[PDB]
Amino acid sequence: TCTTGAGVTSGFIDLATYDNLDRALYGGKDATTYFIKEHYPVGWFTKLPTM
Amino acid sequence: TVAPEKHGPVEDMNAIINALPTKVDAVKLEYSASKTNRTNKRPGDGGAPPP
């Protein structure tokens, strides 16, 4: 492989690391994920100071 | 007068050989990641549609 090269593949070892504890904590079909933010609408309003 | 019998060393094999599939799972995950297309087949395109 490459030592000094800035490679992203080094994290594939961490990805492959997966045990019973990791299965219990992470994973799952219904498990939510980051990098994806759910968006919901909000009310339409305004504000202004008044004497 | 007899054919000599050859076997393994005095030390047990498993302690040296060991077994940990983290490397092969890392390789498989890297290959699966690289399976998806990562290059661009439309150079000189500008794939932003007009507003």
A16 neighbourhood in chain B, CB within 8 Å: 22-23, 25-26, 28-29
Total CB pairs under 8 A between chain A and B: 19
Q: Are B26 and A13 in contact (CB under 8 A)?
A: yes
* Distance of alpha carbon B13 from alpha carbon A32, whole angstroms: 44
Q: Which experimental approach was used here?
A: cryo-EM
Main-chain phi, psi angles of B35, to 5 degrees: -60, -40
Q: What is the resolution of this structure in A?
A: 3.5
Please state, in angstroms and as integers, the Cα–Cα distance from residue B21 to each residue in A1, A22, A34, B31, following that order.
Answer: 19, 16, 28, 15
* Distance of alpha carbon B36 from alpha carbon B39, whole angstroms: 9
A 4-33 near B (Cβ less than 8 A) = 9, 12-13, 15-18
- b/e for A11-35, b at 16 or more Cβ within 10 A? ebeeebeeeeeeeeeeeeeeeeeee
- The tokens of B13 are what? 């094999």
Please name the member of B25, B28, B30 whose beta carbon is closest to the beta carbon of A9: B30
- Distance from the first to the final alpha carbon of chain A: 71
